[PDB]
Design a protein around this ligand. Sequence first.
Ligand code: EIC
Length: 132
Amino acid sequence: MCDQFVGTWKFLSSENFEDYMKELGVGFATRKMAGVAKPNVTISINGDVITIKTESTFKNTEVSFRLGEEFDETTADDRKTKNVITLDNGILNQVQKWDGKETVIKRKVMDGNLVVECTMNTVTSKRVYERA
Ligand SMILES: CCCCC/C=C\C/C=C\CCCCCCCC(=O)O
């Protein structure tokens, strides 16, 4: 149980991410780039501010929030979102809303794997990173 969020993680595998992005409405080309990328995600904490830094990908991002507190974000595929992240039993639950629509991204540490599961409507993807 030193297996906590804080850290850097290296992409390992992916399942169904193509159809999850189709569901989000991401363009054919941006989907291409997202499916070849092998991102590194670094999560850090300072006081009560969490910073998720996504690197080694086609467009690097960085998002800082407090749990329970609404934030704005322009995503890598250029949506203008509203978000609320909360935490429960080790799982960070992110509800991201834009133009009437919603996706839920959940992240949980499993033995130095970070497992990120994204759902929108009917469609789920799982991505697995490993502790760099
Ligand atoms: C953010 C990862 C970089 C590779 C995909 C790139 C950009 C994403 C663009 C459109 C769909 C959003 C995917 C990222 C979801 C949270 C990260 C993850 O599932 O880990």
